[PDB]
Amino acid sequence: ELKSRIDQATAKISQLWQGEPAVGMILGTGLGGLAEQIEQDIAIPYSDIPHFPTSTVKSHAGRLVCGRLRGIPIVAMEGRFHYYEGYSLEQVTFPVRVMKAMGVKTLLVTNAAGGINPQLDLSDVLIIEDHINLMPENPLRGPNDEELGPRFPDMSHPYDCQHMEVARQVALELGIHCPKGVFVAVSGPNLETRAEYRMLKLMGADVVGMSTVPEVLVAVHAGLRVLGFSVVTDLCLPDALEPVELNKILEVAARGGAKLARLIPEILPRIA
Amino acid sequence: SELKSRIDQATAKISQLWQGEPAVGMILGTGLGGLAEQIEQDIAIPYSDIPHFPTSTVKSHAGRLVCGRLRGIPIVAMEGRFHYYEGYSLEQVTFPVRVMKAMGVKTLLVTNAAGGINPQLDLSDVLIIEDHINLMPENPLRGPNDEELGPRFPDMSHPYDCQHMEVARQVALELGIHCPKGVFVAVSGPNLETRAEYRMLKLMGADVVGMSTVPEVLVAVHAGLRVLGFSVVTDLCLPDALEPVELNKILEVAARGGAKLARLIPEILPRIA
Amino acid sequence: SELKSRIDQATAKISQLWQGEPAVGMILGTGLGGLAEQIEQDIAIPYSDIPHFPTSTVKSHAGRLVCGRLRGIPIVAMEGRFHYYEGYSLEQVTFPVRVMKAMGVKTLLVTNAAGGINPQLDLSDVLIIEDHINLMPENPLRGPNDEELGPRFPDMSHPYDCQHMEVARQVALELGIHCPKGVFVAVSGPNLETRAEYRMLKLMGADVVGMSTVPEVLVAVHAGLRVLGFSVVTDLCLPDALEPVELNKILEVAARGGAKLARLIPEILPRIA
Numbered sequence: 001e002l003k004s005r006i007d008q009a010t011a012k013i014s015q016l017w018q019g020e021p022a023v024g025m026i027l028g029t030g031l032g033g034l035a036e037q038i039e040q041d042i043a044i045p046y047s048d049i050p051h052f053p054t055s056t057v058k059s060h061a062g063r064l065v066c067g068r069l070r071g072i073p074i075v076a077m078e079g080r081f082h083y084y085e086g087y088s089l090e091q092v093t094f095p096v097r098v099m100k101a102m103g104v105k106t107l108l109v110t111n112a113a114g115g116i117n118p119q120l121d122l123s124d125v126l127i128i129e130d131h132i133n134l135m136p137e138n139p140l141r142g143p144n145d146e147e148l149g150p151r152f153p154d155m156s157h158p159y160d161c162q163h164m165e166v167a168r169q170v171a172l173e174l175g176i177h178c179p180k181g182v183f184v185a186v187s188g189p190n191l192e193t194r195a196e197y198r199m200l201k202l203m204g205a206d207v208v209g210m211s212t213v214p215e216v217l218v219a220v221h222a223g224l225r226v227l228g229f230s231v232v233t234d235l236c237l238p239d240a241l242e243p244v245e246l247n248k249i250l251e252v253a254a255r256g257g258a259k260l261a262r263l264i265p266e267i268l269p270r271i272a
Numbered sequence: 273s274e275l276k277s278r279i280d281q282a283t284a285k286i287s288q289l290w291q292g293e294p295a296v297g298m299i300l301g302t303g304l305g306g307l308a309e310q311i312e313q314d315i316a317i318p319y320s321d322i323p324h325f326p327t328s329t330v331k332s333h334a335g336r337l338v339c340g341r342l343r344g345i346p347i348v349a350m351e352g353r354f355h356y357y358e359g360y361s362l363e364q365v366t367f368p369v370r371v372m373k374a375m376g377v378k379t380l381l382v383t384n385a386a387g388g389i390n391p392q393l394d395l396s397d398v399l400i401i402e403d404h405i406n407l408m409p410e411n412p413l414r415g416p417n418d419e420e421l422g423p424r425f426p427d428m429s430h431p432y433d434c435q436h437m438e439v440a441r442q443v444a445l446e447l448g449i450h451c452p453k454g455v456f457v458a459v460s461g462p463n464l465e466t467r468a469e470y471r472m473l474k475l476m477g478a479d480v481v482g483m484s485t486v487p488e489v490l491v492a493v494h495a496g497l498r499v500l501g502f503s504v505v506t507d508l509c510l511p512d513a514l515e516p517v518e519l520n521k522i523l524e525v526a527a528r529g530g531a532k533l534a535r536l537i538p539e540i541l542p543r544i545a
Numbered sequence: 546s547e548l549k550s551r552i553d554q555a556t557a558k559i560s561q562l563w564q565g566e567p568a569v570g571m572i573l574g575t576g577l578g579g580l581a582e583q584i585e586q587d588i589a590i591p592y593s594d595i596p597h598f599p600t601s602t603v604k605s606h607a608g609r610l611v612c613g614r615l616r617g618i619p620i621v622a623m624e625g626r627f628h629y630y631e632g633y634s635l636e637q638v639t640f641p642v643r644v645m646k647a648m649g650v651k652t653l654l655v656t657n658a659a660g661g662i663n664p665q666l667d668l669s670d671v672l673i674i675e676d677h678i679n680l681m682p683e684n685p686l687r688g689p690n691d692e693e694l695g696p697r698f699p700d701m702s703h704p705y706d707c708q709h710m711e712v713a714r715q716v717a718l719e720l721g722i723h724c725p726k727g728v729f730v731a732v733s734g735p736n737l738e739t740r741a742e743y744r745m746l747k748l749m750g751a752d753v754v755g756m757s758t759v760p761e762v763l764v765a766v767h768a769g770l771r772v773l774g775f776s777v778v779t780d781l782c783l784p785d786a787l788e789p790v791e792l793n794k795i796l797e798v799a800a801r802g803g804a805k806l807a808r809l810i811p812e813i814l815p816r817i818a
């Protein structure tokens with residue numbers, strides 16, 4: 001069933017690209033600008049790959065970019081799939097399985113997030129150090145295939161210690177402040193209330209988003225090393241909370257994206 | 273994408289029994305159906321006769337759409353609601369809100385029965401809902417978004433209307449009734465909460481707990497309706513001294529709070545509509 | 546509404562294999578299946594031969610219904626259970642509890658393997674479950690309610706029976722075993738929790754965390770059964786000093802707590818009401 005769908009997706013991709021990627025990449029809302037850094041051999045539309053969904057959130061372009069960044073073979077999802085769209089988490093996380101099958105060792109994931117920690121600034125890039133999953137579904141529910149990963153994956157260090165060390169070293173070299181923090185995943189699609197933001201803060205979250213955790217969960221099950229970043233697109237201070245609109249979010253995401261466009265190319269040669 | 277057609281199919285049928293253009297919609301909760309008597313009624317439409325409307329299976333929920341006038345203000349009321357815990361999707365639960373918005377309603381007034389977690393509450397208090405926490409495991413807006421109904425990512429910084437709640441307080445005060453404001457937490461039910469759960473809910477910042485309302489509010493906000501919300505405290509939820517609760521006691525307390533609402537609502541409607 | 550039919554069909558087949566009238570039902574968790582050797586069996590029934598029973602797929606869960614006498618008490622024991630994370634609905638998970646009620650059991654004894662969140666716990670501790678927090682994303686009682694089976698809104702003020710736990714403690718002290726009381730939180734799994742998540746579960750008031758049990762307790766309470774619950778602490782979950790966990794170690798610690806329950810349970814059973 002699952003691994004057979006994985007094998008078919010990868011069998012096809014091999015026929016469109018002879019590359020063996022070291023790093024797999026997932027790029028978030030308003031962060032699609034990052035693909036411009038890649039020397040692209042091929043862009044594979046999601047339809048040409050057996051068992052792939054559809055990207056419908058604005059700014060998510062929806063295609064599989066294959067090539068090289070600083071001479072490091074890579075595969076990048078420019079635009080992702082979201083639970084709030086109506087995709088199952090199996091559908092959301094299938095591209096991760098495919099990256100594993102292609103032979104990537106590391107998944108880099110980026111997203112746009114609300115800043116709950118008051119020490120954050122607008123357009124900060126945060127290094128994800130840990131997460132809290134508050135989504136009402138889990139991508140590993142179902143029969144487990146031990147050829148894919150264990151029944152009970154350990155989550156004591158889902159974000160690679162060595163990768164984040166490198167990410168910090170680069171940030172400092174570039175003179176960029178990248179704080180580390182905890183990412184909380186919620187379903188969406190609505191934004192949070194004032195009272196929900198107070199609760200998430202109390203529970204330990206520094207940023208909140210509607211993605212990423214499902215993919216991280218699947219990456220860890222599959223034995224991939226993870227580096228995640230959040231761009232703080234809006235501030236979520238419940239005692240001074242302003243209405244958020246998608247277009248402002250995309251603007252601030254672009255400024256954070258400019259910073260990742262500096263960081264990521266310096267990071268990749270140092271982690272692979 | 274076929275929802276907009278479901279909405280029109282239901283709306284047109286409703287118009288074939290009623291002439292009105294309601295300015296306010298109202299949803300009445302457990303033990304609070306009696307509030308419908310306040311309306312000078314043109315017709316009461318059973319949910320059976322409306323395309324795509326669910327059925328109410330909970331005790332005291334009458335299952336009818338009351339259309340009429342309250343204090344000269346045209347109005348539509350759900351006498352009895354639908355809950356997630358009955359087996360309805362949140363799309364089903366919140367369908368009437370879409371229908372109400374289509375009918376032309378500007379404001380949604382929602383009422384519910386709730387457990388009192390804040391120890392300053394008293395039995396039969398009418399709380400003015402100032403904000404909420406959604407602990408339900410589904411979201412009624414999940415799935416494709418139709419931009420003609422609302423935005424993909426609705427803002428929730430002010431789900432309960434500021435001016436509506438200000439009017440609700442002034443009326444309370446001129447009537448001499450204490451209506452505290454606070455935070456409503458929606459959980460799925462159908463079981464009531466454990467002692468350890470009540471402690472956690474309080475710590476999370478909830479003042480009252482219920483098994484409804486939040487889905488309808490989410491959909492109301494997405495649709496651009498202004499919301500006014502009230503919880504009647506039907507049972508006290510203090511974990512160091514929690515007594516068994518039974519449905520029949522909850523209905524009795526609900527009635528004393530309803531009688532308070534039956535005084536508050538007709539005085540509020542003309543000042544917000 | 547057709548669940549009774551499924552219940553009768555399963556209770557009929559079981560009477561065909563065993564004419565016993567069980568006083569107690571027992572659910573044996575991960576690595577605890579050895580507790581079934583305490584039963585002087587009359588019959589072991591594979592779940593596959595019982596109408597409507599699912600299949601146990603986690604290691605250590607044998608997937609047999611064990612019927613007999615445990616120190617003189619007629620009993621039915623699930624040697625191995627079902628889990629939401631396996632892809633079962635909670636209706637399927639808890640069907641065996643409905644069956645137990647229909648066979649006549651008055652008390653459900655539930656066991657599980659858990660993570661120890663409270664820093665006062667030790668490895669292999671056997672904890673008396675005093676209350677729970679349900680963080681599962683589905684509820685086994687959602688859907689139409691059959692009054693013949695239980696109330697629409699069960700009370701959860703004392704899910705774990707006060708007298709049963711008092712007897713568990715009396716017997717623990719007689720045997721010289723330390724059995725602390727605490728709150729169990731149920732999460733879906735199947736991944737273990739992150740460090741941030743362990744902190745949050747502590748803050749919410751959890752003492753131990755597991756991936757089962759709560760759905761069965763819910764149904765038990767709905768069905769009028771008295772519940773006695775025990776968690777075996779199989780791994781410690783301190784976020785500032787968290788070590789990776791493998792199922793293999795868990796199973797080894799479970800057996801050590803399992804040895805202790807092997808002593809407790811046969812002493813407790815003849816003493817509870």
Ligand SMILES: Nc1ncnc2[nH]cnc12
Pocket residue numbers: 112113114115188191192208209210233234236
């Ligand atoms: N405030 C917020 N809440 C949830 N997801 C987000 N993504 C970006 N901002 C967010």
Ligand SMILES: Nc1ncnc2[nH]cnc12
Pocket residue numbers: 385386387388461464465481482483506507509522
């Ligand atoms: N204690 C309680 N918990 C959840 N919903 C309720 N509705 C009325 N009382 C309640």
Ligand SMILES: Nc1ncnc2[nH]cnc12
Pocket residue numbers: 658659660661732737738754755756779780782795
């Ligand atoms: N750490 C843990 N988390 C959740 N369930 C468990 N069962 C045993 N150990 C566990």
Ligand SMILES: O=C(O)c1ccccn1
Pocket residue numbers: 178179180181
């Ligand atoms: O490493 C960090 O970014 C950090 C340090 C102190 C507090 C929060 N974050």
Ligand SMILES: O=C(O)c1ccccn1
Pocket residue numbers: 390392393452453454479
């Ligand atoms: O009685 C009060 O004043 C009260 C009630 C609820 C919350 C806060 N205060």
Ligand SMILES: O=C(O)c1ccccn1
Pocket residue numbers: 724725726727
């Ligand atoms: O009875 C107990 O086990 C107990 C007492 C005090 C604190 C925690 N647990």
